[PDB]
Amino acid sequence: GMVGELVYGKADIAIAPLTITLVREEVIDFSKPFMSLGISIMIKKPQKSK
Amino acid sequence: GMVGELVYGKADIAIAPLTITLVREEVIDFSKPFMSLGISIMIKKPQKSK
Amino acid sequence: YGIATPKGSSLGTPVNLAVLKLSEQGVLDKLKNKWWYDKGECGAKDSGSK
Amino acid sequence: FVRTTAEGVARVRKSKGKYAYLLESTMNEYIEQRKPCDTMKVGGNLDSKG
C-alpha cells in the first residue's frame, strides 16, 4: 500500500486518509492529525410517522 | 510555564493538558495526541418545570 | 493535547511510540473513563432517573 | 459482520431501521450527505484517532 511505497522509495510522500497507528509509526514519520475521527453509529432515521 | 522549563533545561519532559499548537511545535517535540477535543457548548439542564 | 519533550532529546521518540501503544491497548480511553465518569460525582444520573 | 464496507451501508438501508453499523466518523459523515439521504450519524465517537 501507500506505506509500502514510502519505505521502498517508490514515493516521496503519502497524502491520504491514512490511520495513524503504532505499527505504522515505527516505519513512517506521521504528521500531526489533520482530521480527528472515531467509531460512530449509523442508522436509517425513520421515516415511520405514517 | 511548562514549555519554558523544557527549552531551558529545568525539566526533561512535560505531561499535562498542553494544547498542540504551531508556535509550540517549533521549540518542542510534541507527541501524538492522547486526547482529542474541541470547542463545545455548555448550558444548564432545563428542568421544565415550566 | 500532547506530551512535550526537548528537541534532540533521547526520550523524544521513545515517548511518542509509547503514547500510540497506550491508545491502541485501550489504556488512554480507560484512564479517560476513570477520572471523568467513574470518579465523577454525577448526581444527574440519579436525580433525573426517579 | 459484513464482507466489505459497501455491504454494511446497504444492509442498514434494507433493514427498516432494525440494524446498525459501526464505522469511522469520517466515512459515516460522508454517507449521511449522499443520496438517498437515508443514513445519520447518532451519538459521539467511541475512540480517539486521526
UniProtKB/Swiss-Prot annotation, chain D:
Post-translational modification note: Palmitoylated. Depalmitoylated upon L-glutamate stimulation. Ubiquitinated by RNF167, leading to its degradation.
Q: Where in the cell is it found?
A: Cell membrane; Postsynaptic cell membrane; Postsynaptic density membrane
Induction notes from the record: Down-regulated in the pyramidal cell layer of CA1 in the hippocampus by global ischemia.
> What tissues harbor this protein?
Detected in forebrain. Detected in dendrites of neuronal cells. Expressed in the pyramidal cell layers of CA1 and CA3 and in the granule cell layer of the dentate gyrus.
Q: Which residues carry this modification: Phosphoserine?
A: 15
Sequence positions that bind L-glutamate: 24
Additional observations: The postsynaptic actions of L-glutamate are mediated by a variety of receptors that are named according to their selective agonists. This receptor binds AMPA (quisqualate) > L-glutamate > kainate.
Quote the subunit structure annotation.
Answer: Homotetramer or heterotetramer of pore-forming glutamate receptor subunits. Tetramers may be formed by the dimerization of dimers. May interact with MPP4. Forms a ternary complex with GRIP1 and CSPG4. Interacts with ATAD1 in an ATP-dependent manner. ATAD1-catalyzed ATP hydrolysis disrupts binding to ATAD1 and to GRIP1 and leads to AMPAR complex disassembly. Interacts with GRIP2. Interacts with GRIP1. Interacts with NSF via its C-terminus. Interacts with CACNG2, PICK1 and GRIP2. Interacts with GRIA1 and SYNDIG1. Part of a complex containing GRIA2, NSF and NAPA and/or NAPB.
Q: Which family does it belong to?
A: Belongs to the glutamate-gated ion channel (TC 1.A.10.1) family. GRIA2 subfamily.
The domain comment in this protein's record states: The M4 transmembrane segment mediates tetramerization and is required for cell surface expression.
User: Briefly, what is this protein's role?
Assistant: Ionotropic glutamate receptor that functions as a ligand-gated cation channel, gated by L-glutamate and glutamatergic agonists such as alpha-amino-3-hydroxy-5-methyl-4-isoxazolepropionic acid (AMPA), quisqualic acid, and kainic acid. L-glutamate acts as an excitatory neurotransmitter at many synapses in the central nervous system and plays an important role in fast excitatory synaptic transmission.
Name the UniProt record assigns to this protein: Glutamate receptor 2
Q: What gene is this protein a product of?
A: Gria2
